[PDB]
Amino acid sequence: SVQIVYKPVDLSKVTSKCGSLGNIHHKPGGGQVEVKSEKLDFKDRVQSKIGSLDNITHVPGGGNKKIETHKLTFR
Amino acid sequence: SVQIVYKPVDLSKVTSKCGSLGNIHHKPGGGQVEVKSEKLDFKDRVQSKIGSLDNITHVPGGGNKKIETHKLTFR
Amino acid sequence: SVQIVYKPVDLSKVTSKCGSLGNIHHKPGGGQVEVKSEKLDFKDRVQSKIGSLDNITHVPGGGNKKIETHKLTFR
Amino acid sequence: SVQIVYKPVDLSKVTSKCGSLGNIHHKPGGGQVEVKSEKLDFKDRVQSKIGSLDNITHVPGGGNKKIETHKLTFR
Amino acid sequence: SVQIVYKPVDLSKVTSKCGSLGNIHHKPGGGQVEVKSEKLDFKDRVQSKIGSLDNITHVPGGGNKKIETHKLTFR
Amino acid sequence: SVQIVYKPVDLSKVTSKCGSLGNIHHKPGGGQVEVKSEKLDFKDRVQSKIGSLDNITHVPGGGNKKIETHKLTFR
Numbered sequence: 083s084v085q086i087v088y089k090p091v092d093l094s095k096v097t098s099k100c101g102s103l104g105n106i107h108h109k110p111g112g113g114q115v116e117v118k119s120e121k122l123d124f125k126d127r128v129q130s131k132i133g134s135l136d137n138i139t140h141v142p143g144g145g146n147k148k149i150e151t152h153k154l155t156f157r
Numbered sequence: 158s159v160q161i162v163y164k165p166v167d168l169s170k171v172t173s174k175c176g177s178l179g180n181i182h183h184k185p186g187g188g189q190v191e192v193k194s195e196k197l198d199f200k201d202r203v204q205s206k207i208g209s210l211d212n213i214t215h216v217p218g219g220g221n222k223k224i225e226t227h228k229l230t231f232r
Numbered sequence: 233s234v235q236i237v238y239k240p241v242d243l244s245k246v247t248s249k250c251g252s253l254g255n256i257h258h259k260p261g262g263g264q265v266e267v268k269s270e271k272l273d274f275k276d277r278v279q280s281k282i283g284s285l286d287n288i289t290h291v292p293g294g295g296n297k298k299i300e301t302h303k304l305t306f307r
Numbered sequence: 308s309v310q311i312v313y314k315p316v317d318l319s320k321v322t323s324k325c326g327s328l329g330n331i332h333h334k335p336g337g338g339q340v341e342v343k344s345e346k347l348d349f350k351d352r353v354q355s356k357i358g359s360l361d362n363i364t365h366v367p368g369g370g371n372k373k374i375e376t377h378k379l380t381f382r
Numbered sequence: 383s384v385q386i387v388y389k390p391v392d393l394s395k396v397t398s399k400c401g402s403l404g405n406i407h408h409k410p411g412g413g414q415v416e417v418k419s420e421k422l423d424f425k426d427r428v429q430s431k432i433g434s435l436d437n438i439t440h441v442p443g444g445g446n447k448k449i450e451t452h453k454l455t456f457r
Numbered sequence: 458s459v460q461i462v463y464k465p466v467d468l469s470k471v472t473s474k475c476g477s478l479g480n481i482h483h484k485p486g487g488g489q490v491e492v493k494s495e496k497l498d499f500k501d502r503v504q505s506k507i508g509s510l511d512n513i514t515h516v517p518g519g520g521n522k523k524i525e526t527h528k529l530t531f532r
Contacts, residue, residue, distance in 0.1 A: 084159045092244075094169045100218070105180045112188035112210060112263060123198045123338065123414045125486035133208045134188035134263055141250075142218045144175040145293075149224045152165050152240075157232045158233045167244045175294070179254045187263040187284065196271045200336040200411040200486070203274060209263035209284045217293045219250040226301045227240050273414075275336040309384045315452050315527075319394045319467075325444040330405045338414040338434035338489075338509055348423045355430040360412065361437070368442045368520070369400065374449045382457045383458040390465045390527050397472045400519040405480045413489040413509035420495045429504045435487065436511040444475065445520045453528045 088154050100144030110135055163229050175219030185210055238304050250294030260285055313379050325369030327362075335360060388454050400444030402437075410435060463529050475519030477512075485510060 112135030187210025262285025337360025412435025487510025 086160070087162045088165065089162075090165045092165075092167045092169045096169070096171045098173045098175065098219070099178075100174070101176045101178070101214070101216070102180055103174065103178045107180070107182045107185060109183060110185045112186060114188045115190045116193075117191070118193045119197060120195045121197075121414070121416075121489070123489045124200060124203075125411045125413075125484070126201045128199060128201070128203045128205070130203075130205045131208075131211075132190065132192055133206070133211050134190050135185060135210045136208070137182075137185070137210075137212045138215075139177045139213070140215045141175045142293075144173050144216075144218045146171050146173055146221045148169070148171050148222070150167075150226070152225075152227045154161070154163060154228070155230045156159070156161065158235070160235045161237065163236070163238045163240065166241045169244045171244070171246045173248045173250065173294070174253075175248075175250045176289070176291070177252045177255055178249065181256045181258070182260060183256075183258045184261065185257075186261045189263045190265045190284075192267045194267075194269045194272060196339070196341075196414070198273045198339045198414040198489075199275060199278075200338070200409075201276045203276070203278045203280070205278075205280045207265060207267055207280075207282045208286050209265050210260060211283070211286045212257075212260075212288070213286075214252045214289045216250045216291045219248050219291075219293045220295045220297070221246050221248055222297045223244075223246050224299045225242075226303075228301075228303045229236070229238060230305045231234070231236060232307045271339070273339040276334075309456070311386045311388070311454070311456060313388045313454060315388065316391045319392045319396075319448070321396045321446050321448050323398045323444055323446055324400070324403065325398065325441045326401045327439045328399075328401070328403045330402055330407065332407045332410070332437070334409045335407060335435055335437070336409070336411045338412045338487075340415045340432060340434055342417045342432055344419045346421045347419060349428060350424060351426045351428070353424075353428045353430075355428075355432075357432045359434045361433055361435070363436070363438045364401070365439070366401070366441045366444075368444045368516075369398070370445045372445070372447045376451045376453075378451075378453045380453075380455045384531070385458070385460045386463070386529070386531065387461070388463045388529060390463060390467075392467045394467045394469045394523070395471070396521050396523050397470070398475070398519055398521055399473065399478065400475045400516045402476055402514045403474075403478045405477055406482065407485075407512070408481070408483045410482060410510060410512070411484070411486045413487045415489070415507060415509055416491045417507055418491075418493045422494060422496070423498045424503060425500050427502045428499075429502075431506045431508070433508040434510065436508050436513070438511070438513045439476070440514070441476070441516045443517045443519045444473070447520070447522045449524045451526045451528070453526075454531075455529070456531045
């Protein structure tokens with residue numbers, strides 16, 4: 083006679099922690115900002131940010147992938 | 158006789174934490190901003206952001222994918 | 233005789249936390265903003281944002297996907 | 308006997324394509340213009356054109372002339 | 383007997399293509415212009431053009447002249 | 458007897474292509490221009506052109522001339 087017991091057990095973690103996590107920003111101070119522009123001429127696309135204390139987080143990553151195959155064949 | 162017990166157990170975790178999490182911004186102070194523009198000429202698309210204490214979080218990622226296949230074949 | 237017990241158990245978790253979560257912004261101060269424009273000329277699309285203390289969260293991601301296939305074949 | 312068959316055949320084409328024909332001006336951007344004049348002294352005819360985007364077609368020519376003669380003389 | 387069969391045939395093409403034909407001006411950007419004039423003195427004809435983008439086609443030529451004499455003299 | 462068959466056949470093409478034909482001007486950007494004049498004294502005809510991107514096609518020529526004669530004389 084044949085007895086087969088198939089009991090794989092998984093308690094695993096797959097985890098990603100991406101970007102800005104758990105930071106403290108105590109009294110951050112942006113300076114005075116002045117932009118004075120005269121007689122400029124642009125022939126193509128202009129992309130402009132003018133600011134002070136600009137705080138930015140960008141996260142295209144951090145994606146988790148788990149693939150798990152279980153197979154049993156008898157005869 | 159043939160006895161087959163198929164009892165795989167999954168208690169696993171797949172997790173993503175993406176962008177800005179648990180951060181503390183105590184009294185952030187954006188500075189004064191001045192933009193003076195004269196006689197400018199633009200011949201294509203202009204994208205402009207003028208600000209002060211501009212806080213931005215962008216997350217195209219963080220997507221989790223889990224695939225799980227279970228198979229049993231007898232004779 | 234043949235006895236087949238197919239009792240796979242899933243208690244797993246798939247979770248995404250994307251964007252801005254649990255952050256604290258205590259008394260944020262946007263600075264004064266001044267935009268002065270004279271004789272400007274634009275010949276294509278203009279996209280302009282003028283502000284102060286601009287808080288923005290954008291999440292195109294964070295999507296979870298779970299695929300689970302169970303198969304049993306006898307003779 | 309005398310037989311004269313005068314059957315000249317004309318299928319000729321005389322064609323002129325003068326000036327601007329079939330041109331494509333996709334999004335032409337004539338820049339900004341400023342003209343400032345002070346204490347100017349003139350004593351004869353003044354001809355002045357001021358603009359930003361001038362498309363001009365002048366065609367004193369392109370004329371077609373077709374002179375033809377068919378003289379048949381008998382004795 | 384005398385037999386004359388005068389059957390000259392003309393399928394000729396005379397063509398002129400003069401000036402600007404079939405050109406593609408994709409996004410031509412004439413830059414910004416400024417003209418500042420003070421205390422100038424003139425004593426004969428003044429001819430002036432001020433612009434940024436000009437597209438000028440001038441065609442005094444391109445004319446066509448076909449001259450054709452058919453003559454048959456019998457005795 | 459006398460038989461005269463006069464069958465000259467003309468399929469000639471006379472073609473002129475003068476000036477600018479089939480050119481592609483992809484994104485030509487004329488630079489910015491400034492003209493400053495003070496106390497100038499003129500005493501004869503003044504001709505002035507000011508611009509940033511001037512496309513000029515001038516065609517006094519390109520004209521076609523086709524002179525032809527078909528003379529048949531019998532006795």
